[PDB]
Amino acid sequence: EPREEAGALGPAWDESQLRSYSFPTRPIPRLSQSDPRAEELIENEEPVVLTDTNLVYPALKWDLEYLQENIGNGDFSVYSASTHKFLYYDEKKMANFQNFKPRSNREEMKFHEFVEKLQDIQQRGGEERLYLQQTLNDTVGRKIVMDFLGFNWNWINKQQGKRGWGQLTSNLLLIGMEGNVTPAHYDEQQNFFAQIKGYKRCILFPPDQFECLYPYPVHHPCDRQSQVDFDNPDYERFPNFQNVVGYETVVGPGDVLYIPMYWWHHIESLLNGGITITVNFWYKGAPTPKRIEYPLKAHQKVAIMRNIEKMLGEALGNPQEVGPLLNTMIKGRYN
Amino acid sequence: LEVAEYLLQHGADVNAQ
Ligand SMILES: C[C@@H](CC(=O)O)C(=O)C(=O)O
Ligand SMILES: [Zn+2]
């Protein structure tokens, strides 16, 4: 599966740089944006790797030196952890789960300080890990503005229109260390995932594997994230994780992965691959269709389950009473 | 058909504070 790079420069990566997991996978298609099969996959909301969009062509020259000189003097959210797992957590929800202690911490920081922290860790051989995750804004320097304007807006705007998506909400800049991992989760927006530097292994699971991936409660800070530790699955708590099957690919500079809304994805920076750089494109999903057709799709049932949990958390006046009432509803009645 | 439309509504939450 590793592609040979032009100029006889050899394989870009090697299977030894991939972490080992308990489940099988099959590859995501790698297609040209002009291939009608690629158009068919996006329309049916299925993942595809597009190899020739030129979506972030001007950003392919980006490295830490260029960015530090040009990305401005704004604050950048930088996560710090002692584990390779950078589990996302919503800070606004930690009040209702005050016995949850995240294993990664967020630190606001200037870009040059992030490069310095990176360098100091590299020097002292430390094992602290950093993952910069910052939405692009108007604090960026002029050259970054020019690069941003140089993205292939013609292509992605036509995608937005053809799929009826809502607004572009964010462009998340992602700069991670080799071996970094974002555990499995699904997002409530459409995503074009544009790789810039380094290589990222992406493992996706369709929405109909909800039963196998056990998301946290909606009111938990790790809402939308899987409870399963992919490194040591607890099959007694999560028995159906023994049935997961992933869609896998390794994206490199110039590749764009369509991560459809509600699709779970596990993403890791290749071992011994250096730093990785990515910019995503998050779009609001199309509205609920005019006429509902039955039976519902998996992602529609996910939307329903989320709304049930939201309603009960509100009606009961306390999110931690959601579980007890749900169990009362079902024990000896629906199970 | 409104109960269905109500429960089918989605947010826009992503892994970004
Ligand atoms: C942050 C990203 C994961 C990663 O690249 O580490 C992701 O889940 C996304 O763009 O939706
Ligand atoms: Zn995501």
Residue numbers in the entry:
A (entry chain A): 15 to 349
B (entry chain B): 692 to 708
Article, verbatim:
2-Oxoglutarate (2OG) and Fe(II)-dependent oxygenases couple substrate oxidation with 2OG decarboxylation to give succinate and CO2; they have important functions in human biology, e.g., in hypoxia signaling, extracellular matrix biosynthesis, lipid metabolism, and DNA/RNA damage repair. The human 2OG oxygenases studied, factor inhibiting hypoxia-inducible transcription factor HIF-α (FIH) and aspartate/asparagine-β-hydroxylase (AspH), catalyze C3 hydroxylations of Asp/Asn-residues. Like AspH, human factor inhibiting the hypoxia-inducible transcription factor HIF-α (FIH) catalyzes the post-translational oxidation of Asp- and Asn-residues in a 2OG-dependent manner, however, to give the β-threo hydroxylated product. FIH was initially identified as catalyzing hydroxylation of an Asn-residue in the C-terminal transactivation domain of HIF-α isoforms (Asn803 in HIF-1α), a reaction that suppresses HIF-mediated transcription.
High levels of FIH substrate hydroxylation were observed for 3-methyl-2OG and 4-methyl-2OG, both of which are natural products, regardless of the substrate, indicating that these 2OG derivatives can efficiently replace 2OG (entries 2 and 13). NMR studies reveal that FIH converts 1 and 12 into 2-methylsuccinate with a similar efficiency to which it converts 2OG into succinate. The FIH Kmapp-value for 4-methyl-2OG is similar to that of 2OG, indicating a similar affinity; by contrast, the FIH Kmapp-value for 1, the 3-methyl regioisomer of 12, is higher. Although the C3/C4-alkyl 2OG derivatives were used as racemic mixtures, the crystallographic analyses reveal that, at least predominantly, the (S)-enantiomers of the 2OG derivatives bind to FIH, potentially owing to their ability to engage in more efficient hydrophobic interactions with the hydrophobic Leu186 and Leu188 sidechains.
